[PDB]
Amino acid sequence: VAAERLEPRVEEKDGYWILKEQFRKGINPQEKVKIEKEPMKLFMENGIEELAKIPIEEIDQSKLTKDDIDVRLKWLGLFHRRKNQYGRFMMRLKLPNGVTTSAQTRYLASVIRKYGKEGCADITTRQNWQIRGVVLPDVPEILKGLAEVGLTSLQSGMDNVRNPVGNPLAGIDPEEIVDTRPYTNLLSQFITGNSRGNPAVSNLPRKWNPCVVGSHDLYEHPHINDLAYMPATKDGRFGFNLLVGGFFSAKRCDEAIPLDAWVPADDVVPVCRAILEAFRDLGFRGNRQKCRMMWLIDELGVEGFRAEVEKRMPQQQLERASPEDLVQKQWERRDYLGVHPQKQEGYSFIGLHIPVGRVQADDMDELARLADEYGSGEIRLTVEQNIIIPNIETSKIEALLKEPVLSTFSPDPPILMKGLVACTGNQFCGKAIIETKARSLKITEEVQRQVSLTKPVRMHWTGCPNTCAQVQVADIGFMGCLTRDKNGKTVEGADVFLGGRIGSDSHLGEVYKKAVPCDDLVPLVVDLLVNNFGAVPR
Ligand code: SRM
Ligand code: SF4
Ligand SMILES: [Cl-]
Ligand SMILES: [Cl-]
Ligand SMILES: [K+]
Q: Which ligand is nearest to the CA of 160?
């Protein structure tokens, strides 16, 4: 690779970072949008105030403002549901480590409550909140209300650093390696400029996923993140080995690979900045399917990429990876659903199943009430779109288990429901080929009626090849497709994936059977469970 390839392609201009004029040839349309107007101005120069006052019908009549609502608003966490819910916006937060409060939960519920049938909320596969039904005129007030309860929505979509994922058992688990909350909190604060906005990292070639590991279980899925911090001692010091470039896409899925780098714990933010700077500065900005960070690593090679990170470290040192990390390979992923003792004596946490991550405002108020009456006001989200309420005096558990709402959000659902994960699908997502959430519930219920099992089989349903519900990590994955019934009529289908493994011995699953009509999935899945996962016909 030439020395010329290493020339930074972006420059700071008026507090923002923009593509240098020599590197603007052949860029994709999204890069054009970013050049035409810096998205961060909608927040940092309060451009949202004036945009929000324009009727949508009129917004749609010019390119600049249509690009504002359909693309630039994703820098403010706002996603126009143009096809399936015209004029309404899904809104996505930053929620490092999945940690929320009862007050935050009540505030979000109060927002969606206003929108009635157009509102609801969802836990995401990055242990994050999404809310729905938002109208543009309400945006200025919602942004103020979020700030008031200590939330931000900044930089949560498009070409930005996504929600920092950590250990859902951080601080409470007797077996944790290192509490991940301080580090995911620092990362989020760094990425969003302490909720003011951070333009140094808001103009990447593409989305970029971080996680910090603190569990032997690897609840954080480090193998599928752009940057994963793996806890490791080096020369007597606590820190992290770094894995880089994991990603899923319609074209390619790849697991993260060692950068061959270790940082002390205090260097978590400096190396996150160095890697993002290298990615921002040097990454390809053509075909969107070749813009993820792994593609840069493949072009430069891991050593060439590593050198770029190294020059962007303070004092310009990057130590080599330590031989062995702290994650024990001898480990069985623990079920966190149900009631479990904390490391603080006399306290328990409870894991509650949220069916396919979907909640309404009344449900959110109930969960917030439980967290206040039984816990410490804290609610934790998980990447299986479930919840944990920590910090419950164990003497209160008898009473808690009698709460009516626990019959809906159960601490002990059937085993197949425990592991069930589903993306938004075509109820709201315009890219979706099929309906996912209702369908996956109905199918899973009918399957579980027919078989009993002991192994915790994880089933993931995703509505299109973007694979937001990560079908490549599942024991059985279902990817939306259109197919044909026996009479040649169009019907919703799934491509069925097998082979996905998580934890230290991770593996990416692959298509096993294409184009299965959804209405035929029950018998197929019953047989797979009996033949491959030890299930027993009832
Ligand atoms: C909500 C969520 C799925 C869920 O039900 O849980 C989601 C939903 C969306 N994803 Fe995703 N993705 C979500 C996690 C994922 C993950 C899983 C992960 O992060 O571990 C992946 C695969 C992992 C990865 O990216 O490496 C992912 C892969 C993407 C892709 C393909 C990325 C690529 O490189 O090609 C897109 C399309 C794109 O960015 O070009 C997509 C884009 C979309 C959009 C924004 C599509 C569009 O705008 O309509 C979806 C919004 C639908 C809606 O209204 O909810 N989403 N998305 C997740 C929100 C996570 C969060 O809180 O930040
Ligand atoms: S996998 Fe496809 S259908 Fe599901 S939320 Fe992602 S983009 Fe939408
Ligand atoms: Cl996006
Ligand atoms: Cl859409
Ligand atoms: K769930």
A: 3
CATH number for the domain harbouring residue 487? 3.30.413.10
Q: In whole angstroms, how far apart are CA 197 and each of 39, 77, 134, 378?
A: 11, 12, 21, 26
Q: Is the CB of 464 under 6 A from ligand 2?
A: yes
- The interaxial angle of helices 293-300 and 268-282, nearest 10 deg, is 80
Approach to solving: X-ray
Q: What is the resolution of this structure in A?
A: 2.0
Residue 488 domain boundaries:
414-538
**Bridge partners for 517 per DSSP:** 493
Cβ atoms within 10 Å of 238's Cβ, excluding its own: 14
Written as one string, the DSSP assignment of 25-66 is TT--HHHHHHHHS-TTHHHHT-HHHHHTTS-HHHHTTSHHHH
Q: Which of 335, 363, 395 is the last residue of a domain?
A: 335
In the block, residue with structure tokens 């201009």: 13
DSSP SS3 for 330: coil
State if residue 468 touches ligand 2 by the CB under 6 angstroms criterion. Answer: yes
> Taking the CB of residue 530, how many other CB atoms lie within 10 A of it?
15
DSSP secondary-structure letter at 501? B
Please indicate if the annotation marks 65 as binding a ligand.
Answer: no
Number of domains in the chain: 3
**Whether residue 294 sits in one domain with residue 379:** no
* 380 in a labelled binding site: no
**Position in ligand 2 atom list of the atom nearest CA 430:** 8
431 lines ligand 2 (CB under 6 A): yes
Q: According to the annotation, is 454 in a ligand binding site?
A: no
For residue 18, give Cα distances in angstroms to 156, 203, 259: 19, 7, 27
Helix (H, G, I), strand (E, B) or coil at 500: coil
DSSP state letter for 10:
E
CATH of residue 45: 3.90.480.20
- The region, left, alpha or beta by phi > 0 then psi within -120 to 50, assigned to residue 31 is alpha
Q: Same domain for 419 and 363? A: no
Q: How far apart are CA 462 and CA 532, in angstroms?
A: 22
* Alpha helices in 162-246, H assignment, sequence order: 181-192
Pairing of β 536-537 and β 451-452: antiparallel
Statement to judge: residues 7 and 135 lie in one domain: yes
Domain match, 176 and 293 both? yes
Question: Which DSSP letter does residue 283 get?
Answer: -
Contact 526, 517 (CB under 8 A): no
Quick one: tokens of 268? 């978590």
